[model samples]
Target: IPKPTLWAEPDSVITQGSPVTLSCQGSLEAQEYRLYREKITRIRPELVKNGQFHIPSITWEHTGRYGCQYYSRARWSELSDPLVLVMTGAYPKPTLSAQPSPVVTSGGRVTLQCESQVAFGGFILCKEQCLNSQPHARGSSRAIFSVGPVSPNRRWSHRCYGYDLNSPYVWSSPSDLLELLVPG
Candidate 1:
């Protein structure tokens, strides 16, 4: 078998106490699924919902990389690509704002500016079921996300967070939600 697949539900990054799901998908004949924490050890799945592991509430210590594999023919399937789980609210929040304005036309481009009072290694911009981007730090406290190709008329909203290099898996609180309006 090639390998299993792993991904986080809702998102790979989320706030503490948020119910999260780590899903695994493999061959239909998969007999059993197993999840590992950074390859250290195994974490039993609370319940198998189509080979998924439900986390009632994710905590700071829960932040890390995870992978899953399946058992078949008395052998375990190849490990899936590691999925990173980042916990937010470990630090202060970062503010995200649209450049020029939040208004845009079809196929237009907009830049997202994320800034924070507390210095961080970088900033992450996550659009609500839209898109996510990682902009490296500029002077340890800022990031400019060059976004583009604004959809013709899509509901746009976003949030931002900052994280330190020392603890890449733990992030700061999210910024105020910013909504972009497309003019008619």
Candidate 2:
């Protein structure tokens, strides 16, 4: 039989600068527990006397969906359910703007950038549909989500989610939804 899954509080949003901790507790012995992320990458599980995971400083890369796994002396178990994490120091709402194409004849391009005081682990851009994109590279103070060459007739909106490192279940609130106007 599988052990019941456990979760940490505020399961979705974590702010930078503020101290945060991720925790998981089960009936099994502490030594038998293991943790993993993205359902593939294996992370050395930090053992807690009472069952807790601590992350000292959280950044943008830590924000994303994650799961945990358990192990025993005889066999290893499957991963637990996944959770989303959002980090802090980001704008209350993600920003959206556009830059016109340099060539007048070419289709105009609009770029949307999401800026935050702290670098977020990741962000999602959506308008009637969601564009889940991760900023390439890591170890930055902030992360930006960008889009361009949008059609003039359609309205656009965007939001971003961030999380702290070490904790898989914590996340930040969705940025205030943003709308775009394509000028003819």
Candidate 3:
């Protein structure tokens, strides 16, 4: 069984908001290939030309382990080796969760924690000032590449992200939808 070979560009970092091209080269001639993400269909390789999978404006949603396989002469080949797509930068928004419920005392410290399940070296935290209305104002308060506690808030929202030094790809999941409601 023949397997397809995959290679990534720039080696180290796959930055968010950038296009990533996944190229597959096969050993056997006149063979068709299929790219899979965790054993799912990602791309279908053509025999006439080379096969390349592209992700434009990649985000945390695109971060995952990828692999590929090829078919030739009515025979299916084995799966290719898996590759990791590391989205560079702190997550665009953090995974938000509160200690208690959403209720908190006004001007009192509330603990906000953001996390990602994927392997990450560091994280960045941000505060969205206006959760009361649509398209609220957003500002970056602290950039912590490591895990830590952030202060509480009233009528504010928070987000976190993961990042590395050289990689432009930042693994940022969707900003966990959370609200800091002041206690009556």
Candidate 4:
């Protein structure tokens, strides 16, 4: 029996009162699907016609661990990996600023700092259009990350987000973009 998989559209982290869709995929033969939050069942099992469950509007109360399972041939498949849904309130977005200015000379190291009024468990620095960089947990409202002594020919744009350590899966909205220019 193939275990089902669940995922969220746009992303798992959402602003409060936003709509999101949770989709489950499993054997096409599956006849019914069940959605669960923190192991507790949600609404009645839905027919597998579309394999999508919609949340018209989500609130903090709706945030938690979520999973899905399907029944086929009178047997129930194992639950999918839990998807953490985080609903963020009006917490202000983190701020990202680069030291040594956004324009860097060749082979110059740059430091990036992320700060937020909302206490967060950790911080993530992302190079726009690139894979998410490593995550840092300083147990403070502010964090500093470093970028390489990059070549002058390369330019990079970066952003950051903060997350609650208690619920690492949920992240605050992304900070404004900070462009890094390397003069050739």
Best by TM-score: 1
Clashes of each: 0, 20, 22, 0
1-184 in candidate 1: lDDT tens per residue?
A: 7598898888887778787888899889888888888618678555666689888887766788888889877789888999989888888888889998888777888988888887778677887732334534443677777666878557778888887665677878889998877776
Model 4 worst lDDT run, 10 consecutive residues: 128-137
- Which residue segments of model 2 deviate by more than 4 Å? 46-50, 95-184
TM per prediction: 0.79, 0.45, 0.46, 0.71
- Candidate 4's C-alpha runs over 4 A off are 39-50, 104-109, 126-139, 147-156, 166-173
Residue range 52-113, candidate 3, lDDT tens digits: 67666766555666787667778776777787666645445446666655566655555555
Which candidate leads in lDDT?
1
In candidate 1, how many Å is residue 41 off? 3.6
For model 1, which pairs clash?
Answer: none
Per-residue lDDT of model 2, residues 100-145, tens digit only: 3212222445455545556555555555444544543452344544
Candidates in descending lDDT order: 1, 4, 3, 2
Candidate 2 or 4, higher TM-score? 4
* Predicted structure 1: lDDT: 0.79
- Model 3 global lDDT (CA atoms, 0 to 1): 0.54
Residue 62, candidate 4: alpha-carbon lDDT:
68
Stretches of candidate 3 off by over 4 Å are 39-41, 44-49, 92-184
Candidates ranked by TM-score, best first? 1, 4, 3, 2
TM-score of 1: 0.79
